[PDB]
């Protein structure tokens, strides 16, 4: 009988201080109908955003996942939860007559954040190469994979979340990947394919306070 949108509130999300655009969208939730709290319903909400709509003008095909866990009124405070890539880009990366290389490490930061860094690797045909095949040996792939193991062990363990998030915005890790493995096999298309959250520590408000500055 009654319209369900009459008792509907409206809320706004806030990007963290690491990004250039603080406001990216809005959401809507019902009222506090008895024991059910509207602030609780914003806790289990995942806002799936793009990086080009989050910073100014850059590489556009990167993808972010955000989680909201702190509301007080007419505002929603977000946090980094995971990084992905578009299906079209990764489908464009896979091609025949080249070798695909996968490497994942379960790593920990200085705080209690358990990460999982998926990366892909695709070989580069030389400009003067006459061979159409352009493959690599298995032990070369194992050496490149072990190089990826020690690189993602080195760059995440010694430092906190904010600096590796700020390193994730450009292709710093990726350029380090071409710079490290140029001697083994020249490969040109490398990306961090997926970042998956594994374990969260005990939640506190203060780290969310200087999360947004």
């Amino acid at each position: 009988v009654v319209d369900p949108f009459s008792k509907k509130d409206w809320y706004d999300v806030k990007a963290p201080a690491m990004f250039n655009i603080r406001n990216i969208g809005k959401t809507l939730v019902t009222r506090t109908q008895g024991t059910k709290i509207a602030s609780d319903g914003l806790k289990g909400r995942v806002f799936e955003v793009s990086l080009a709509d989050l910073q100014n003008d850059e590489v556009a095909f990167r993808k972010f996942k955000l989680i909201t866990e702190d509301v007080q009124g007419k505002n929603c405070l977000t946090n980094f939860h995971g990084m992905d890539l578009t299906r079209d880009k990764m489908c464009s990366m896979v091609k025949k007559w080249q070798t695909m290389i996968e490497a994942h490490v379960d790593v920990k930061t200085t705080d209690g954040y358990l990460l999982r860094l998926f990366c892909v690797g695709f070989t580069k045909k030389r400009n003067n190469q006459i061979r159409k095949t352009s493959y690599a040996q298995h032990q070369q792939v194992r050496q490149i994979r072990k190089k990826m193991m020690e690189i993602m062990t080195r760059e995440v363990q010694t430092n906190d979340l904010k600096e590796v998030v700020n390193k994730l915005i450009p292709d710093s890790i990726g350029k380090d990947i071409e710079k490290a493995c140029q001697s083994i096999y020249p490969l040109h298309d490398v990306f961090v394919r997926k970042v998956k959250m594994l374990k969260k520590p005990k939640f506190e408000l203060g780290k969310l306070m200087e999360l947004h500055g």
């Binding site: 578009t86 079209d88 489908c91 464009s92």
Partner: protein, 101 residues
């Protein structure tokens, strides 16, 4: 008699290959015998891309594509006119036809 040099497949020094289910059909055709289709297509068709372009918030927004691989049984390939039949000396031709459109 023997029709082809091979047997409609690419099994030379294996003796056994993994079968993969068809798309239109559900046959358990092997990998080397089945005809594989890798089509390059946009999200939408060609007579609406401009109508998308004035309806976009962004400026000069590039239309994404779809990258799928189709696995065809030979009966589904001949039924959908993907591959046709040739003559005796016309079957002695490995190269694909030229892609003009």
């Amino acid at each position: 008699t023997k029709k082809r040099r091979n047997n409609g497949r690419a099994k030379k020094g294996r003796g056994h290959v993994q079968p993969i289910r068809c798309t239109n059909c559900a046959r358990c055709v092997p990998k080397d015998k089945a005809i594989k289709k890798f089509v390059i297509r946009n999200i939408v068709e060609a007579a609406a891309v401009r109508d998308i372009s004035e309806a976009s918030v962004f400026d000069a927004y590039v239309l994404p594509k779809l990258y799928v691989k189709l696995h065809y049984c030979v009966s589904c390939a001949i039924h959908s006119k993907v591959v046709r039949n040739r003559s005796r000396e016309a079957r002695k031709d490995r190269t694909p036809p030229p892609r003009f459109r």
